[PDB]
Every structure is written in C-alpha cells, then in structure tokens.
Design a protein around this motif. Sequence first.
Motif, PDB file in Angstrom:
ATOM      1  N   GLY A  71      27.672  33.049 -11.154  1.00 29.51           N
ATOM      2  CA  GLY A  71      26.667  32.116 -11.641  1.00 29.51           C
ATOM      3  C   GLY A  71      26.882  30.614 -11.746  1.00 29.51           C
ATOM      4  O   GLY A  71      26.377  29.998 -12.694  1.00 29.51           O
ATOM      5  N   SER A  72      27.602  30.010 -10.803  1.00 33.04           N
ATOM      6  CA  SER A  72      27.796  28.563 -10.845  1.00 33.04           C
ATOM      7  C   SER A  72      26.403  27.947 -10.801  1.00 33.04           C
ATOM      8  O   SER A  72      25.430  28.621 -10.456  1.00 33.04           O
ATOM      9  CB  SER A  72      28.631  28.099  -9.654  1.00 33.04           C
ATOM     10  OG  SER A  72      29.966  28.555  -9.781  1.00 33.04           O
ATOM     11  N   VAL A  73      26.283  26.676 -11.140  1.00 35.48           N
ATOM     12  CA  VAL A  73      24.952  26.100 -11.138  1.00 35.48           C
ATOM     13  C   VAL A  73      24.689  24.953 -10.175  1.00 35.48           C
ATOM     14  O   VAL A  73      25.480  24.012 -10.072  1.00 35.48           O
ATOM     15  CB  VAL A  73      24.588  25.675 -12.540  1.00 35.48           C
ATOM     16  CG1 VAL A  73      23.140  25.230 -12.585  1.00 35.48           C
ATOM     17  CG2 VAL A  73      24.850  26.831 -13.480  1.00 35.48           C
ATOM     18  N   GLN A  79      29.044  41.197 -13.418  1.00 37.40           N
ATOM     19  CA  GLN A  79      27.609  41.013 -13.533  1.00 37.40           C
ATOM     20  C   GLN A  79      26.887  41.395 -12.249  1.00 37.40           C
ATOM     21  O   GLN A  79      27.321  41.032 -11.152  1.00 37.40           O
ATOM     22  CB  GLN A  79      27.290  39.546 -13.848  1.00 37.40           C
ATOM     23  CG  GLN A  79      28.135  38.908 -14.958  1.00 37.40           C
ATOM     24  CD  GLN A  79      27.670  37.493 -15.330  1.00 37.40           C
ATOM     25  OE1 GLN A  79      26.591  37.303 -15.910  1.00 37.40           O
ATOM     26  NE2 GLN A  79      28.486  36.498 -14.988  1.00 37.40           N
ATOM     27  N   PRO A  80      25.781  42.150 -12.365  1.00 34.67           N
ATOM     28  CA  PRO A  80      25.005  42.561 -11.189  1.00 34.67           C
ATOM     29  C   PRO A  80      24.445  41.297 -10.548  1.00 34.67           C
ATOM     30  O   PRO A  80      23.728  40.542 -11.200  1.00 34.67           O
ATOM     31  CB  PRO A  80      23.913  43.441 -11.796  1.00 34.67           C
ATOM     32  CG  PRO A  80      23.722  42.841 -13.155  1.00 34.67           C
ATOM     33  CD  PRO A  80      25.159  42.662 -13.595  1.00 34.67           C
ATOM     34  N   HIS A  81      24.759  41.053  -9.282  1.00 36.55           N
ATOM     35  CA  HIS A  81      24.275  39.823  -8.676  1.00 36.55           C
ATOM     36  C   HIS A  81      23.074  39.827  -7.768  1.00 36.55           C
ATOM     37  O   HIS A  81      22.904  40.676  -6.885  1.00 36.55           O
ATOM     38  CB  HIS A  81      25.401  39.055  -7.986  1.00 36.55           C
ATOM     39  CG  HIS A  81      26.491  39.923  -7.466  1.00 36.55           C
ATOM     40  ND1 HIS A  81      27.721  39.419  -7.102  1.00 36.55           N
ATOM     41  CD2 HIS A  81      26.562  41.262  -7.284  1.00 36.55           C
ATOM     42  CE1 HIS A  81      28.504  40.410  -6.723  1.00 36.55           C
ATOM     43  NE2 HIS A  81      27.826  41.541  -6.824  1.00 36.55           N
ATOM     44  N   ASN A  97      26.927  44.782  -6.665  1.00 33.28           N
ATOM     45  CA  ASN A  97      25.577  44.300  -6.859  1.00 33.28           C
ATOM     46  C   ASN A  97      24.734  44.969  -7.902  1.00 33.28           C
ATOM     47  O   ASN A  97      23.733  44.404  -8.313  1.00 33.28           O
ATOM     48  CB  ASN A  97      24.844  44.301  -5.527  1.00 33.28           C
ATOM     49  CG  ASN A  97      25.631  43.592  -4.443  1.00 33.28           C
ATOM     50  OD1 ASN A  97      26.625  44.123  -3.924  1.00 33.28           O
ATOM     51  ND2 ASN A  97      25.207  42.376  -4.105  1.00 33.28           N
ATOM     52  N   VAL A  98      25.116  46.160  -8.337  1.00 35.06           N
ATOM     53  CA  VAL A  98      24.332  46.833  -9.367  1.00 35.06           C
ATOM     54  C   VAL A  98      25.203  47.261 -10.539  1.00 35.06           C
ATOM     55  O   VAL A  98      24.752  47.974 -11.449  1.00 35.06           O
ATOM     56  CB  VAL A  98      23.605  48.075  -8.820  1.00 35.06           C
ATOM     57  CG1 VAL A  98      22.704  47.682  -7.679  1.00 35.06           C
ATOM     58  CG2 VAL A  98      24.609  49.112  -8.378  1.00 35.06           C
ATOM     59  N   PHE A  99      26.455  46.825 -10.517  1.00 35.92           N
ATOM     60  CA  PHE A  99      27.379  47.170 -11.582  1.00 35.92           C
ATOM     61  C   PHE A  99      27.356  46.138 -12.713  1.00 35.92           C
ATOM     62  O   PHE A  99      27.274  44.921 -12.485  1.00 35.92           O
ATOM     63  CB  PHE A  99      28.790  47.293 -11.023  1.00 35.92           C
ATOM     64  CG  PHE A  99      29.773  47.892 -11.985  1.00 35.92           C
ATOM     65  CD1 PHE A  99      29.522  49.129 -12.568  1.00 35.92           C
ATOM     66  CD2 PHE A  99      30.987  47.251 -12.255  1.00 35.92           C
ATOM     67  CE1 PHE A  99      30.467  49.723 -13.398  1.00 35.92           C
ATOM     68  CE2 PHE A  99      31.947  47.831 -13.084  1.00 35.92           C
ATOM     69  CZ  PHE A  99      31.689  49.071 -13.654  1.00 35.92           C
ATOM     70  N   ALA A 145      14.791  35.673 -10.952  1.00 33.65           N
ATOM     71  CA  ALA A 145      16.216  35.919 -10.935  1.00 33.65           C
ATOM     72  C   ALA A 145      16.762  35.999 -12.345  1.00 33.65           C
ATOM     73  O   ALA A 145      16.712  35.027 -13.108  1.00 33.65           O
ATOM     74  CB  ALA A 145      16.923  34.812 -10.174  1.00 33.65           C
ATOM     75  N   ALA A 146      17.272  37.170 -12.701  1.00 38.22           N
ATOM     76  CA  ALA A 146      17.861  37.336 -14.014  1.00 38.22           C
ATOM     77  C   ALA A 146      19.024  36.346 -14.050  1.00 38.22           C
ATOM     78  O   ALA A 146      19.846  36.293 -13.126  1.00 38.22           O
ATOM     79  CB  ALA A 146      18.359  38.762 -14.190  1.00 38.22           C
TER      80      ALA A 146
END
Lengths: 549, 50
Positions: free
Chosen positions: A334-336, A302-304, A407-409, A316-317
């Motif tokens: 994406g932990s919360v 996921q792009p971060h 970061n963009v993958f 923030a997506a």
Amino acid sequence: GVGVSTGSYDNQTHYRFLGDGWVEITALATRLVHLNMPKSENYCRIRVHNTTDTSVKGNMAKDDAHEQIWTPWSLVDANAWGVWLQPSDWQYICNTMSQLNLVSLDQEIFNVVLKTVTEQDLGGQAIKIYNNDLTACMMVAVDSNNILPYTPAANSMETLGFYPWKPTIASPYRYYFCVDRDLSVTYENQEGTVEHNVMGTPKGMNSQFFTIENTQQITLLRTGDEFATGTYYFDTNPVKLTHTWQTNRQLGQPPLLSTFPEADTDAGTLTAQGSRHGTTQMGVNWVSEAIRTRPAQVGFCQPHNDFEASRAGPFAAPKVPADITQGVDKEANGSVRYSYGKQHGENWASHGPAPERYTWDETSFGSGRDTKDGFIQSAPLVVPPPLNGILTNANPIGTKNDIHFSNVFNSYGPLTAFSHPSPVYPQGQIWDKELDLEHKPRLHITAPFVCKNNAPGQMLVRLGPNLTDQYDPNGATLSRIVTYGTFFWKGKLTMRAKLRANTTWNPVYQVSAEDNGNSYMSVTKWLPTATGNMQSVPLITRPVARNTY
Amino acid sequence: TPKGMNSQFFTIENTQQITLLRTGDEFATGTYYFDTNPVKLTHTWQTNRQ
C-alpha cells in the motif's frame, strides 16, 4: 472604519523549550486569499456518469460515477503540513524530536477587500477598469458543531498554497449525495455485454440536503470589519518520529553460538537444531530461527487489489501502508501515489496540465511483506515439502494464473501488531474527523491525527450577492454586478514535541541537504530559479531508528 | 460420555436463597442499574465511495 488595517501578517515559527526536553512549537501562517463570485447563486444536485469509460469491458477500476450537491459557498482549508512549516523546520523537527502532537488551533480573517469590474473603450478595444466597492460585504461561517459533511481539501490538493509570498484561492464546497449505483464485472475482451451500468434516483430514506444558510451563524463583514474564531484544543494522540526495523525474526534472544569466528571474514555456528533448546509450535524434533516461537506478529499479509462493492459501486479496499521489502512489492504493501499541482509542490517550470507525481514508501521495515518468498506448508510438517504439500506464489487460485494465494490471503489477527503510517511533509493531511460509527477503525490512513472528540469546524466563505437596478425573483436570468475580493487569513497551529535521546555508539541517519547533483537531496530543488520557479518535494519523516523490543 | 474435567451440575437449592410465599405473601427485588452503552436510532448511508 475604512482605510485602516485590521490585522498583522505573520508566517513565523517559534520554539519554546520547557524542562525535560518538552518543546512547544508555535506555527504561524498568513496567506492572501482571492475570492471570486459564485458560478451560480443556487444549490445544485449534480449527477456524474462517465459511461464513455465504464461501458468498456474490464474497466470497472476507472469508474467514478456519483451524484453530488454543489454549494455556492467556498472553504478555507489549511489541513496540510505544507501550509504551516518551512522545509528546513520539518527537517529540524524530524532530525531532532522523538514524537509530536497537536495542541491548539487559532484563526482570524482580516483586511477584507471588495471590488467590481466594468469595461471601457481604449482605441476600439474593450479594457477592464477596477473599482473599490465599499458597502459590499463578504460572508463567513464556521460549522463548529460539524453539522455539514466533512470534506478535507487535502483530499483533492485544494488546501492553501504552501508558498507564503504567493496568493491563493479557496476550494468550493461540495458534498456527496445519496443514490444507488450498479456496475458489472467484465475483462479485456470478454464476449457478451456490460449487463448493468445504471444510476439510481433519490431514496426517501437517505436523502440529505443541507444549506449553509439554515445551519450556520453567518457573519457579514465589509472592508473595515474583521473576524476570528475562538481557540480550538485538539484531543489527539502523539505520533512517533522514529522508524522501526526489527522483524518477526529479530525478537528475543538470538541463539547461542558454539563456535566463534577467528577472522573478520568467518561466520559463527550454533548448536545443532536437533539438540538445541527452545520452543516452537511444530511437532518436529529440532528448532530453527524461522520455525521458532516469537511474542507476536509484526506486520501481516494483506489481500491485494481487492475491489469490493456495495450500493454505489465498487472501490479499492484501502491498504495499511508498510515497507516494500527487497521484492519492491509497492502496490502490495500500500505505498501511496500523490498527484499534485504547482501551488502544492510541483515545479513551476513544468508544462501544460501534467501533474507531478510521487510515491511514498513507508519506512516501517520490521513489518513489510515479500510476496514472492511467502508460502504455506501442509498439515503435519515435513522437513522438505513434497510438491503437493506446499502452496506457493506460482500456483493459481481459482483457475487463473497470475492470481495466487497472496491476493486473497489475510493474516490479520489477535497477534498482529504494527507501526502507525507516518506523516508526509509538503502535501500530507494533518488531522481528521472520526466516523460516526458505533464501532470505529483502529486508525485512518489518510491522516496521522484523528480527533477523539468533536473536530475543528470547517470554515466557509462566500461573496455577498451584489445586485443591479434590475431584479426579478422569477426571472431565470440573474443579472448581477461583477465582483470579487481578497482577504488575509492567519492561523496559529500549536504543537508539543519531545527531544530525542542519544543511546547508540554509532552515528545515525539524519536528513541532510546535499551538493548540486542527482541525489534526492540536491539543495537546488529547494531554491529559486533565475526567474523564480519554486519546487517542493517530500522529505523523509522518520530518519532515526528505534528498538522495537 | 461425561468428562471428569468439564462436568458441571448445578442445583437451584444449593446456590440460591429461596423465598417461600403463600397467597398472602409478596416479593420484590431491589433495583438493578445497567452499565451499558447507548444505541443510535439513526441509520447510515455513506459507503466507502462517499
């Protein structure tokens, strides 16, 4: 009809066992709610611009400007696990069941109490006297048709308190209004200026002003009255209480060994890659586990920290949670991060406003991603790749270092498969309404249960306007008698779960209390202090593991 | 050029039922029922930030 209770108090939890290990769980909860007079008897359109922060170069991320409608109504939201269960139960359930689903929901309000305050002299000082107003009423309503904007209180840790023996309050009803907003990109000390940072005006095509009074059926209730909703049935999907582990590299028939270890310290060996049987999608003439063909893709890149943007600013997506791997790429998977109050878990001994925080790390091990070890090779495939024939997490994209392909993958695709984020005990949201969009999202990350049909209506309450002898419609001064009330709320949440089966030889992971110490599970955390301070931290939701394929 | 595996030449004459009609004739199709999904005539506004 005054002077007589109108309800029963109950905060128990019952388990009913049917055949075939199905289990009906009935969660009962009661709370004493405290309601205050509305700040204003009016509906207010309020703008909020934090220029003081947004105007600093490279601070887009701290933006939180918008315009909202403020209603004089408050709401009772019980949409949060912490409301219904008792730590231990959550333990029990998680350690014993294999899956769980929502069934029905029942609520009723009762034993209403209304009071007014006046002041008097007691030694020169002004003290407050409390009196019962009998004729005064309270107001209730339920948007069962979901006309109003859906607003989960769990979103802001404003649900009801997770502690039964202690009173609570309601969250006031407010909803987003439509106005466009623009903000430009800048960084740490970029020379120039913050070009745009504006807030628009009401648009004719998107202005939506709703009122409780014009959309709901309001029920008035004095102290002797009582109120209840019918029963609501959820049409939702079950959630597994088991976690996964197999990763794209443990799917299928592990390779055939040709030599067997002769001592507990040795390793085995396979036939040579050059003469091994199998399949790959590479033209090479050998085969190895990592290049080998597998059914599908477990997890994905996921792009971060992708901020996107559209007519009301940037944001923030959201990221689908997943395990963090060894690379502890928390933010990357994406932990919360939960920031909560005392009434929702925080230790009561803590001081000042300081919120307590926790970060949830998903347990779906087969799907995590280690950024540092990820890479791409070039077209035809080459045994060891030339410096030029392989992109890594060191090479810079665009022209900045620190900013690599990761970061963009986005490797999401038809073969992407994965686990459903688990529920988080004390503070987690339980169900949610779906978005009215022709093309829905495969899930929500804020909650486990998404209603396939219409969702439970939101419960709104409000104290009835209590006037004085002096009243004038055109006067800006709305003089009214000081008043406030209390009332009990009782809900019946019904779930259905199935008992887990025992198939392994080896024992298995279970949530357990543990002697007073450091370990996250120091039983003391769940005990009172000598003055009674309570604390409630989250628990693992999926202790046991399940084969994935 | 034409590939052996993908060449598809169709003719009306070889696939349909042709009806001839002089001036006095007339023709009609049966009724066709669509099995489709509805379209909303309302637009949206809330963005990820509302």
